[PDB]
């Protein structure tokens, strides 16, 4: 509706025509337009969604074409792209997996709940770290005033 | 414990309620009748020998079970 | 909800009141 | 050693015809089978308690 | 690698050795140790509370 | 006669009954499944053929242009089945199609084409059945199962109970098509039939019939009799059908004739119809109100004016009979409705008929179909018609077609595939006298119902989809009528059909992973039936009569295979003979009997008609010409069975074995077991791990060779020869001349496997049986395979077993096996775990896999080479590394007084993080083999290269050595043709062998098959040179790793599992353990010939699971190796020839006419020498599953070798030394080794890792998973007074993020308190409650 | 963070129902906003309320709703009040039922010899569960230097 309405605007039968052929390119704009915009979790740029669609199809041609499939260096010569600014965008697709997905088991453990954390210190690492501002503070303590002080300076 | 252990136990509590159900519904002792109910008739003597306490004849029997069998 | 445990194959005078008041489907509307 | 049983249907209709062996001796194609009706039920509703 | 248990406990945990697998926690806390300890160590809970 | 292998070790055999059809190919289902789907069907109604021409041809919207299908043909694989498990790939072949398309012109649309280009197409692939029925999706043997899924029919439930909680059973008639609506005959409590279209709106069930071109005389015609009254002058005189009113209440009394035949109110009986008849009361009188509670049958109307005086379905007073009189119709017509059989169902329907006529009736349903909006006459009339007529919109398949015409007791057995107004008034006449007490219901667990799918059809059913997902879109595509400017290219688009395909074959509850643990594991997941998956019912939806056992099951499914627990009942295993129709019904043979006679013509029969005969019983004799020996034979008809005679029997069973699965049909003695003994002793069939050196069944019942056959383990004889090397690599077979083919013979060579992991991670190897300079025959087995031993199937081993208590070691269900066990190796396993290893370039850039790697010390790496791999060979253990990899981590922003240490002792913290990959926790074993994947566009490693150089010459030297082998056969076969017509004497054998193809011979057939062989053999030399450079090519390629990968590693570790305490070890037929204790043999118990029993029992096992099958079994195994014993004493003493051979002579036979017959004519020696050192372990008995040997003869071969009868001997206490009272038994029971092995089971954390969302420790052991604290056990610990337990149990051990630091630092400083904190769980839930507009707080 | 978009090694990613959720709440009112300041037809902009009213229903929970707007899975999109609720939800499982540190499984087996007040022990479990005591007890003995 947004082109259509954006359309009423700028469509003009001062030549003589129809609106019906008029609108679709303004309402092809504006699905597609959005399409690219708002429809993952995440965004891409739509000069990349303008590539990863023309990947998809020209994948299409050549995988039903030469037999078997597009090989990243097939597409290279069909596509001449470097095939490492290619295959990165062959990696950008399949947006992320519903962590509500149910595992196997039968035990209805979802995905989420095996993704491990990785900002957690380490239990023993703090339990490390705790004797280490005691042992410096060991030898700190056997310092001079100003070798102790001039080290917790530094 | 074991599956099997219990499930034996399962399996005769259904079947010792099943000899139980099916041989209560024979009547036990009385005076006989003489004469099936539904129609007042004779029951013969034969019949009044096999099950001491039938009430009906054959047929009435029959029809009360064929009633029965669709259960209302 | 009477409840009922309907299946496939404050409520009961509530969902009866609510069952007596006679799509939302954004399509269909 | 004895007979065993009589050896109802899941329901709780009971098969008329006993299974006169027992397992000292062995039991015949028919008689396990009129066996596995019991034995099926029982497990199975051993298994949902 | 296998969990010894007394056997006259298999019947308090209704669990025969057909494979059976317990599981065995630490009480980390001394107040942890000692309710373990005076209230739920088997030689003290013997009778059935049923 | 005994075959060269079953002359080896020829298994005595018990049996008396005889044989009369061999075990067929028992993955039957699967390979003539696939072989439907992937052919050429002529008559197209399978495979490919049938979906293409389900949607082709395919026309435009009338658009001059036209696409039709002309034919397909499948691709050779790029992969062959080895190379496509070790990549990973599905072993699949690209699906080829020549699609013809059509456009016309102007004024040419039934004429001539404007033009016509053609182009063979790709269609995606198709995944290709292996030889052994199984698949290959992705580096995984994947097997799909049959499906279990009621079939397009007719069905009458009934529904006992439960509808109106009064006791009435009501009556619900279906019909279930194949592709249309669902037709649905129901009852009320009222008796009056109703009808439902899909679930829909109820309707007074002749309000079809009235919409069926139907009006009330016929109708009431149709569907009850006629008691015709009449105006005989005098007080309505009536005739009647003596039988027709039998028992009931005589209403009116009979009388008549001057007499009376009964009174009033009056019961009467058979005899007074036959009074009745034999008087023959053609007509009596009634009184007038005696009529006035019938329906009058027909219509009565006017004459005079042509007025309605009264109609069909309207009971008339004596007023309206007065206006019956007064008119003169001297008849009057009345329905027969009895409560007790002729029930009034029609009418009363009547009476709720809302309509009178026909067109109302269908503007009436056309009001329900299309609610809300208003009729009109034809479009009505057309929906109601194309709702059930119209072939797009209904059609019964021929299994529909049939199943209807069968239930109807109909014998046409095919027509349309839409019903017709004849065959809904069957089904309205079938309801109703089922309702009228006859007849019986057609309970849905019936194999009569139930169609078995099977992995052809679904994939072709999930395949025809994907079809006409395509084709909407090139129709679409082809609307737009384009110019001369296209290809059947830019219309066909692939990725759909393979992604429907993949879905498929990817996931599904079919598909299913396979259990490749042993031969009869995956030979019975071959043979599987779930009633699970798509199309079916799944879990909740139905149950405990799906899951029940039904006497259609016999033969057809085993009633004791089954899973225990979960689903029961839904994974019913096929049986032995059992096997598809060609409607998908399972039938199962049965012997045609003549008059008294037992012909061997067999007929497979489906449960659909097995009830319309009487079976025989196997365990029923005959007197050598099919005369039944007894005069009253058992025999099951439709359900039950009673005694029957010799001339009323209509067929009679296959086997014994018939009635049980080929997983159950292994056990000995099954007879002597309760049912669920040996559901679970088939269970723990299916569960043992191969052993190592594995011995065999020393009682077995004769599947065995066919489990062992029918698998893919053995690499069996191809065509019988003789084998020329036999090696551990390899085995090749010199073929002989008779079976040879006729141009260039040269010979077969079978390419065992050696040690390689199978799905569970365990490992899969043949071992060749023969000997070399050794003869063949065709189903004679070469090479063993894993679980087999000698052509039999040998899952565990058999030991030394006694049943006594022995000090509580086996108080429950445990075991105490000898130490003498342990340590003769019998009970090893190999389990070849596997362990990958990728390098993900991320953000920081690539990952490299040096050895140079942060902390690790110079012995502490010790076996990596250059590259960072470990060497083939080295033994690992728990931390080694396998391959060192490394990960940059960019500015870690390190700690302070972590940069005054580093500053102090000059040291950095590098670029490179830890990310190495490292033996697990415990696993430890060897380093068999080494993969090395890479990226195609990326440099290779130094042990890649060196995995390649050896990669190349492995295939060269393969084709060297098969060359040569090749080479020597042809050239053999030259020198020979070379010895006939014409023979080179001996100055061929002086020039070289390749010189002597070019010297030809004299001008007959042994110059063309010369030629033939000279211009072959040049060809085979080219075609090689090719096929090598193209293996060559294959491994010097790249790889084609998912993205963001860059090389893997795939290492293969293969530990061996020494047994234990803890690993569960359970008989043949169910009765399991857990070995407790370990003991040295002195003190395991020892006979008074001073051997140590090696297992100990508990002999409280047999009373409450009564399996007797243990203690009768271990007895004829004491007396197998007892036999055995005998032989040893007399052939390491080496006795004689002659006398060993009669002792094994009377042996091999004793029992009243056991089956087979053994005996030494053609033997021996050669032979007996052989017989016997193949049978010094153990004469290996055989005993058919229900057939087996008696109690008798089992005490006959006690008493051949010198045990004693009773089976039981005299033990001595290892310990004590002193005599146990009481004789214990003893005997060779065959255990097994189940995989609940502890020491991938025992496990556990002090503090690992943590879930990301909700901070709380993992699930797995994989992720180091701490033990759940369910519901119950924190009800558990609140029955105590535990609570600071509790609260640290469920605070500081799980949940707390800052008191479980706090709670490891007290820990490690010795002071044992507890900081409580907020619950992480708790937060969450606070931040979730009030993510909505609710405000949660936690007041002060 | 409750909601995480989590990397998945290989490439792929991770997320929660949630923050699709979010993500077409948040569209639709971009749009309503949109439609607000163009000042279209109140046919359009009334769907768009109606259609934000949706989407916030279906955020707030997935039953009253009629369908329970699922995604390119096959599956029902899991909205808030469904990770509150349920066996699988917080309360009834994971708030209760939680995983425990210092706790190990493993077969059981009999050893009758050892009295009832005490049961017998793998050596490598007994070694796992105890790890921290036996650091706190080889630095207080003084056979080691730190922790690590
Ligand atoms: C439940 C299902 C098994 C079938 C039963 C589970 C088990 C683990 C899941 C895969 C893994 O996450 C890895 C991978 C991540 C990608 O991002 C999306 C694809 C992959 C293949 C996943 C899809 C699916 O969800 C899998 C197969
Ligand atoms: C086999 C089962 C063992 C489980 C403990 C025993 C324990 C108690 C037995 C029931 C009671 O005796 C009462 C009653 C007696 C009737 O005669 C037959 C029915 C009843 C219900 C019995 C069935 C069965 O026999 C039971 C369940
Ligand atoms: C005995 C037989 C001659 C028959 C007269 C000759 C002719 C072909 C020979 C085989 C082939 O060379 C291939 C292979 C080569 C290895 O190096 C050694 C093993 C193999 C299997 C050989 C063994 C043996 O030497 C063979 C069977
Ligand atoms: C154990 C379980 C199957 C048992 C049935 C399998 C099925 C899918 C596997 C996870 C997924 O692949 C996603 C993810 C990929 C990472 O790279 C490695 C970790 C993750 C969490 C995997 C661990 C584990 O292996 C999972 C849970
Ligand atoms: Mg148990
Ligand atoms: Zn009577």
Not at chain 1, 120 to 135: G, I, W
Not at chain 4, 12 to 33: K, M
Not at chain 7, 117 to 141: D, N, S, T, V, W
Request: hydrophobic share 35%; aromatic share 6%; charged share 30%.
């Amino acid at each position: 509706n947004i082109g259509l309405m954006k359309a009423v605007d700028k469509f003009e039968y001062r030549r003589g025509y129809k609106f019906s052929t008029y609108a679709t390119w303004w309402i092809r704009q504006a699905i597609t337009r959005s399409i690219a915009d708002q429809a993952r979790t995440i965004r891409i740029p739509v000069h990349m969604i303008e590539t990863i669609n023309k990947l998809n199809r020209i994948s299409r041609q050549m995988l039903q074409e030469m037999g078997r499939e597009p090989t990243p260096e097939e597409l290279a010569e069909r596509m001449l792209m470097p095939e490492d600014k290619i295959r990165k965008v062959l990696k950008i697709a399949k947006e992320p997996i519903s962590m509500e997905t149910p595992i196997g088991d039968d035990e209805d453990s979802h995905l989420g709940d095996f993704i491990e954390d990785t900002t957690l210190e380490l239990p023993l690492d703090s339990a490390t770290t705790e004797s280490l501002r005691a042992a410096t503070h060991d030898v700190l303590a056997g310092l001079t005033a100003r070798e102790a002080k001039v080290l917790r300076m530094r | 414990s074991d599956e099997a252990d219990e499930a034996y136990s399962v399996t005769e509590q259904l079947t010792m309620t099943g000899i139980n159900r099916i041989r209560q519904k024979i009547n036990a002792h009385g005076i006989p009748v003489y004469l099936c109910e539904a129609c007042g008739n004779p029951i013969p003597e034969a019949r009044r020998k096999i099950f001491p306490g039938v009430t009906l004849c054959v047929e009435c029997q029959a029809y009360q079970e064929r009633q029965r069998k669709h259960y209302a | 909800d009477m409840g009922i445990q309907v299946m496939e194959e404050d409520a009961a005078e509530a969902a009866a009141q609510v069952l007596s008041s006679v799509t939302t489907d954004p399509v269909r509307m | 050693a004895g007979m065993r049983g009589l050896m109802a249907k899941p329901d709780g209709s009971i098969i008329e015809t006993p299974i006169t062996a027992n397992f000292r001796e062995g039991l015949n194609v028919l008689q396990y089978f009129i066996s596995t009706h019991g034995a099926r039920k029982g497990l199975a509703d051993t298994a949902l308690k | 690698k296998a969990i010894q248990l007394h056997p006259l406990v298999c019947a308090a945990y209704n669990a025969d050795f057909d494979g059976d697998q317990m599981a065995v926690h630490v009480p980390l806390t001394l107040e942890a140790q000692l309710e373990a300890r005076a209230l739920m160590m088997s030689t003290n809970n013997i009778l059935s509370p049923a | 006669v005994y075959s060269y292998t079953e002359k080896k070790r020829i298994r005595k055999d018990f049996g008396k009954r005889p044989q009369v059809l061999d075990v067929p190919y028992l993955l039957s289902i699967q390979l003539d499944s696939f072989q439907k789907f992937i052919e050429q069907d002529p008559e197209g109604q399978y495979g490919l053929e049938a979906a293409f021409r389900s949607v082709f041809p395919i026309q435009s919207y009338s658009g001059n242009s036209e696409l039709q299908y002309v034919s397909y043909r499948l691709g050779e694989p790029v992969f062959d089945v080895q190379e496509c498990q070790i990549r990973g790939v599905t072993y699949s072949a690209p699906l080829r199609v020549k699609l013809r398309l059509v456009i016309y012109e102007r004024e040419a649309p039934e004429g001539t084409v404007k033009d016509i280009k053609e182009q063979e197409v790709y269609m995606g692939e198709i995944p290709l059945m292996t030889d052994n029925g199984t698949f290959v999706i992705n580096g995984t043997e994947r097997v799909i199962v049959s499906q279990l899924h009621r079939s397009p029919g007719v069905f009458f439930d009934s529904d006992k109970g439960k509808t109106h909680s009064s006791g009435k059973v009501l009556y619900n008639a279906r019909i279930i098509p194949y592709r249309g609506s669902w037709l649905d005959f129901e009852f009320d409590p009222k008796d009056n039939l109703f009808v439902r279209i899909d679930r829909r709106r109820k309707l007074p069930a002749t309000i079809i019939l009235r919409a069926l071109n139907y009006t009330t005389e016929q109708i009431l015609d149709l569907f009850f009799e006629k008691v015709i009254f009449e105006i005989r002058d005098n007080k309505l005189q009536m005739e009647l059908v003596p039988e027709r009113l039998r028992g009931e209440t005589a209403s009116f009394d009979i009388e008549a004739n001057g007499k009376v035949y009964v009174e009033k109110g009056r019961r009467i009986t058979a005899r007074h119809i036959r009074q009745l008849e034999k008087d023959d009361v053609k007509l009596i009188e009634v009184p007038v109100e005696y009529i006035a509670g019938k329906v009058v049958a027909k219509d009565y109307i006017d004459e005079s004016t042509g007025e309605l005086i009264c109609a069909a379905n309207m009971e008339l007073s004596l007023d309206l009979l007065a206006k019956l009189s007064q008119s003169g119709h001297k008849r009057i017509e009345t329905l027969f409705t009895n409560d007790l059989d002729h029930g009034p169902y029609i009418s009363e329907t009547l009476r709720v008929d809302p309509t009178n006529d026909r067109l109302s009736a269908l503007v009436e349903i056309y009001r329900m179909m299309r609610p809300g909006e208003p009729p009109t006459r034809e479009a009505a009339e057309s929906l109601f018609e194309n709702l059930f007529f119209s072939e797009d919109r209904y059609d019964l398949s021929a299994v529909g077609r049939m199943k209807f015409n069968r239930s109807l007791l109909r014998e046409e057995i095919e027509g349309s595939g839409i019903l017709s107004k004849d065959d809904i008034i069957d089904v309205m006449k079938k309801l109703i006298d089922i309702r009228n007490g006859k007849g019986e219901v057609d309970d849905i667990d019936h194999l009569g119902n139930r169609r078995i799918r099977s992995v052809g059809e679904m994939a072709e059913n999930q395949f025809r989809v994907g079809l006409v997902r395509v084709e909407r879109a090139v129709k679409e595509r082809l609307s737009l009528g384009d110019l001369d400017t296209l290809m059947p290219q830019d219309m066909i688009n692939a990725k759909p059909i393979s992604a429907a395909v993949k879905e498929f074959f990817g996931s599904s509850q079919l598909s299913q992973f396979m259990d490749q643990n042993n031969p009869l594991s995956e030979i019975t997941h071959k043979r599987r039936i779930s009633a699970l998956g798509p199309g079916g019912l799944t879990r909740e939806r139905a149950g405990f009569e799906v899951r029940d056992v039904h006497p259609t099951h016999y033969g057809r499914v085993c009633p004791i295979e089954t899973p225990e627990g979960p689903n029961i009942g839904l994974i019913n295993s096929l049986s032995v003979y059992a096997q598809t129709n060609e409607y998908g019904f399972l039938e199962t043979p049965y012997r045609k009997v003549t008059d008294g006679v037992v012909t061997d013509e067999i007929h497979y029969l489906s449960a659909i008609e097995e009830g319309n005969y009487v079976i025989a019983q196997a365990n029923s004799n005959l007197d050598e010409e099919g005369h039944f020996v007894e005069d009253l034979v058992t025999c099951r008809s439709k359900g039950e069975s009673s005694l029957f005679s010799r001339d009323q029997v209509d067929y009679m069973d296959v086997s014994t074995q018939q009635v049980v699965s080929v997983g159950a049909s292994l056990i000995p003695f099954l007879e002597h077991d309760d049912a669920n003994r040996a559901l679970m002793g088939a269970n723990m069939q299916r569960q043992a791990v191969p052993t190592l050196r594995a011995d065999k069944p020393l009682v077995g019942t004769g599947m065995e060779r066919a489990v062992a056959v029918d698998s893919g383990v053995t690499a069996v004889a191809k065509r019988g020869g003789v084998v020329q090397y036999v090696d551990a690599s390899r085995i090749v077979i010199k073929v002989n001349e008779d079976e040879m083919y006729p141009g260039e013979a040269g010979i077969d060579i079978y390419n065992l496997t050696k040690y390689t992991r199978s799905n569970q991670n365990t490992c899969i190897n043949q071992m060749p049986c023969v000997s070399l300079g050794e003869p063949v025959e065709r189903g004679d087995v070469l090479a063993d395979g894993p679980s087999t031993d000698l052509g039999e199937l040998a899952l565990g081993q058999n030991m030394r077993v006694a049943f006594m208590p022995w000090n509580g070691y086996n108080f429950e269900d445990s075991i105490l096996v000898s130490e003498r066990v342990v340590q003769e190796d019998r009970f090893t396993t190999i389990h070849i775990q596997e362990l990958a290893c990728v390098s993900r370039d991320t953000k920081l850039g690539p990952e490299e896999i040096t050895a140079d790697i942060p902390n690790v010390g110079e012995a502490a790496l010790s076996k990596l080479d250059e590259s960072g791999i470990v060497y083939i060979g080295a033994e690992v253990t728990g931390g080694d590394i396998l391959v060192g990899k490394v990960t940059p981590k960019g500015e870690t922003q390190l700690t302070p007084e972590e940069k005054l240490l580093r500053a102090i002792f000059g040291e950095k913290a590098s670029d490179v993080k830890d990310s190495s990959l490292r033996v697990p926790n415990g696993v430890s074993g060897t380093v068999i083999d080494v993969q090395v994947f890479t990226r195609d566009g990326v440099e290779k490693d130094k042990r890649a290269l060196e995995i390649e150089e050896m990669q190349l010459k492995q295939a060269k030297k393969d084709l060297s050595e098969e060359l040569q082998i090749l080479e020597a056969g042809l050239f053999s076969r030259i020198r020979a043709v070379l010895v006939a017509g014409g023979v080179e004497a001996e100055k061929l054998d002086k020039l070289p062998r390749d010189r002597w193809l070019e010297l030809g011979l004299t001008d007959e057939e042994k110059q063309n098959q010369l030629e033939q062989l000279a211009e072959q053999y040049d060809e085979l030399k080219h075609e090689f040179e090719k096929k090598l450079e193209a293996k060559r090519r294959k491994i010097t390629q790249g790889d084609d790793l998912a993205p963001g990968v860059l090389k893997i590693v795939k290492v293969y570790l293969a530990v061996k599992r020494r047994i234990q305490p803890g690993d569960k070890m359970a008989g043949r037929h169910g009765n399991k353990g857990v070995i407790s204790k370990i003991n040295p043999i002195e003190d395991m118990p020892y006979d008074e010939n001073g051997t140590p029993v090696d297992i100990v029992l508990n002999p409280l096992g047999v009373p409450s699971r009564m399996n007797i099958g243990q203690i009768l079994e271990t007895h004829l195994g004491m007396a197998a190796k007892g036999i055995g014993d005998k032989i040893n004493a007399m052939l390491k003493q080496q006795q004689e020839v002659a006398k060993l051979r009669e002792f094994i002579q009377r042996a091999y036979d004793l029992g009243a006419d056991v089956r087979q017959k053994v005996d030494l004519s053609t033997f021996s020696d050669e032979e007996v020498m052989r017989l016997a050192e193949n049978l010094r372990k153990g004469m290996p008995i055989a005993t058919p599953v229900f057939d087996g040997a008696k109690e008798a003869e089992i005490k006959e071969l006690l008493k051949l070798g010198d045990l004693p009868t009773s089976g039981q001997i005299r033990l001595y206490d290892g310990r004590t030394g002193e005599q146990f009272e009481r004789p214990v038994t003893v005997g060779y029971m065959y255990m097994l080794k189940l995989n609940h092995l502890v020491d991938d089971k025992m496990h556990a954390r002090s503090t690992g890792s943590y879930s990301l969302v909700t901070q709380q420790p993992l699930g797995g052991k994989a992720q180091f998973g701490g033990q759940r604290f369910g519901e119950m056990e924190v009800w558990a610990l609140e029955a105590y007074g535990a609570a600071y337990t509790l609260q640290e149990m469920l605070t500081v051990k799980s949940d707390d993020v800052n008191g479980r630091t706090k709670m490891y630092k007290n820990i490690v400083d010795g002071n044992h308190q507890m900081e409580p904190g907020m619950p992480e769980s708790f937060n969450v839930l606070l931040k979730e409650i009030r993510s909505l507009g609710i405000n949660i707080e936690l007041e002060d | 963070d409750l909601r995480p978009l989590v990397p998945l090694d290989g490439g792929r990613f991770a997320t929660s129902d949630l923050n699709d959720l979010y993500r077409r709440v948040i569209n639709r009112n971009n749009r309503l906003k949109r439609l607000l300041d163009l000042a279209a037809p109140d046919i359009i902009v009334r769907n768009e309320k109606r259609m934000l009213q949706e989407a916030v229903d279906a955020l707030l929970d997935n039953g009253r709703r009629g369908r329970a707007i699922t995604g390119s899975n096959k599956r029902p999109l899991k909205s808030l009040a469904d990770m509150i609720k349920g066996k699988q939800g917080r309360f009834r499982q994971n708030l209760l039922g939680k995983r425990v540190d210092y706790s190990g499984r493993s077969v059981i087996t009999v050893g009758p010899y050892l009295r009832l007040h005490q049961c017998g022990l793998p050596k490598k479990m007994a070694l796992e569960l105890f790890k921290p005591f036996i650091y706190g007890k080889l630095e207080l003995r003084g056979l080691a230097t730190t922790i690590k």
